């Protein structure tokens, strides 16, 4: 877990450059968040690209509108999408909507004049704008080189995003190898640390260190095998003059025994 990427907690921090390579790793995490959000940023910037159809200034898609339409938006041609978003915002601003479905909008001659032949005049409604979208997508959009331009649009950023992803993946496995090396050298550091601790402790006062390491080795021998509570106390005097729980435990025993 946490062990795998690092172990740096405290090592006496001799020649404490560990803070510095720490900071290095920190800034690596910084760059990681950076690149992540950058990929997301490029995604987002793309998002609009497939959905826009404004570029006209540098087959031909700008279909002309109806007299009603040029009365509505004052614009003569283009795509239906632009017109429908426009009338969408129109409904928004005039607020002819209703919110009990919501697409029911209070009709107005500014609008109903778009379909007056079906005697919609018989009923100015509060009806689904979707019904109008269905109405005005061919009912008033009609008619009455630069092929290269179709290239220079959304596809661009998509392709370059793919290139960037590809080269990032290209560099990834080298990073993986470096991480393996990191783990290795870390474990080696760790062992060497243990050794140094041991050795300096020996430097302190070898008598006590020797006694303790010896006893610990013996104890390890034993625990790695069957275990016994007391190696000693055949020297009865000590553990019995200097101990009395023997009395109580005994008492408990004899009752059953």
């Amino acid at each position: 877990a946490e062990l795998i990427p690092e172990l740096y907690s405290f090592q006496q921090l001799v020649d404490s450059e560990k803070r510095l390579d720490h900071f290095i790793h920190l800034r690596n995490l910084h760059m990681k968040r950076m690149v992540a959000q950058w990929e997301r940023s490029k995604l987002s910037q793309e998002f609009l690209y497939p959905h826009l159809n404004f570029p006209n200034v540098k087959e031909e898609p700008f279909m002309s509108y109806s007299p009603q339409l040029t009365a509505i938006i004052g614009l003569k041609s283009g795509t239906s999408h632009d017109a429908i978003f426009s009338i969408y915002k129109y409904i928004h601003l005039n607020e002819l909507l209703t919110n009990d479905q919501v697409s029911i909008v209070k009709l107005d001659t500014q609008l109903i004049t778009l379909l007056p032949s079906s005697l919609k005049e018989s009923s100015p409604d509060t009806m689904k704008l979707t019904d109008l979208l269905s109405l005005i997508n061919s009912t008033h959009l009609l008619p009455l080189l630069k092929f290269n331009n179709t290239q220079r649009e959304s596809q661009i950023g998509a392709a370059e995003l793919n290139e960037n992803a590809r080269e990032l993946e290209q560099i990834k496995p080298k990073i993986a190898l470096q991480d393996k090396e990191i783990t290795s050298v870390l474990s080696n550091l760790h062992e060497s640390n243990k050794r140094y601790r041991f050795f300096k402790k020996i430097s302190e006062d070898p008598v006590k260190a020797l006694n303790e390491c010896i006893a610990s080795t013996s104890n390890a021998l034993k625990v790695l095998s069957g275990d016994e509570g007391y190696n000693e106390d055949m020297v009865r005097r000590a553990n019995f003059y200097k101990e009395n729980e023997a009395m109580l435990r005994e008492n408990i025993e004899v009752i059953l025994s």
Partner: protein, 482 residues
Amino acid sequence: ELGAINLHALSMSLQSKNLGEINTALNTLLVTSADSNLKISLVKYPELLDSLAILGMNLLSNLSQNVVPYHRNTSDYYYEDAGSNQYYVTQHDKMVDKIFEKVNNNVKQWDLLPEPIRFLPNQFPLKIHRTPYLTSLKKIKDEIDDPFTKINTRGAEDPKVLINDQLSTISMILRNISFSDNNSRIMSRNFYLKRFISDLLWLVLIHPENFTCNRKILNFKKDLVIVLSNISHLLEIASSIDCLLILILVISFGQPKESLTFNEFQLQWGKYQTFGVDILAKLFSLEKPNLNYFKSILLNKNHKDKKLLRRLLNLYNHNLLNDVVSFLFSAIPLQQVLSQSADPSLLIDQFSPVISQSLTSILVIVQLPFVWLSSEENIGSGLLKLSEIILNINNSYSKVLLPSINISCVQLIKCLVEKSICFENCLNNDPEILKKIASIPNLFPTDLEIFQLFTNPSVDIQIINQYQLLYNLKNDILTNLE
């Protein structure tokens, strides 16, 4: 294993001798571990919990007092006699004895059951143990084999480790008991259990050294936060100290390194950092004018208790709850938004919403001298992209999705407006803030997205309003900027 039938072992546990305590505690622990068919019902149980908390309190106490129990030279430790009495003496005639006494030569208070909890003289608050999950490797380094392991992996050749492992086992079995109905039995009414929790906390964090293996400390923290997870009701008697304790406990996790202090956790190691926010929601939902209010006082920057409280805040050095914010900001992002699909999300998604809930709740509690802002090239907010993810999911577990996205949007708007109005009221910063606010790629869903949204799903009315008012504030900021 097997055998091991009765429940009434409590009696022996209630008894004050090492022997019985071992005999029961170990057994009953093994018991509550088994679950294949083994559960601890509730009929006239409670006595069990009482006994348990009493034992733990006393042991931890005289441990803090650094004195071994179970073995002295006193015994049957009060009066023993067969004096001049049949059944009714110590009336007037008793003074005759005085007379008798004056011629032959020729009231109390009683303490309560448990000991006090805090104000203990030896235990005086000095900052130690505010260290993160990192200590695991410390643990490793501790548990590492070495000529001086001092891990008496065997029994108590000295009583210190005995008390240690005793308390450890108690904690563990307490955890295991806490996984069912009968949480109500544990529900904040075992005043004993709560005293235990409190003083145990007050030790584990303000811990003058008597604990042997740091791993024991980890175990304590761990099963403690777990058993907390299985509480969903009141806490915080003598609150303030306990509230700060719990906050530090949850803050235990997550990697530290103004700005956010917490590297978001790479979610493939831990599962406790979960439990943390889980509790900080559940055991914090109670808007009763206590808990929320305790943390509200924790906004600030017998009676001696109050001295303690500030005593720790400056002993945690401005503000601090920003750290809580940063902590809350972990485990959500940067992995699911960096995956290859949105389906593996749903799992930790189930976990996610309580976090945002906690957050927006605490933002009801911030409406005075501060400097706070938490969108500074620290998180951005993929919350928008996340919302888009769950949206696309909607039109393509369950029961949590819509509320999650809704509250995400609400969070966005509320934190935005609160930041703005706060640094307006202080007015210690240039209007650049607006420009600063206006400079986020992770912000303000594009109006084209609004439009296309306004059409297809038609099943998100409330969410539509959310985005609507969001965009409204956006456009407002744009306008009034100039």
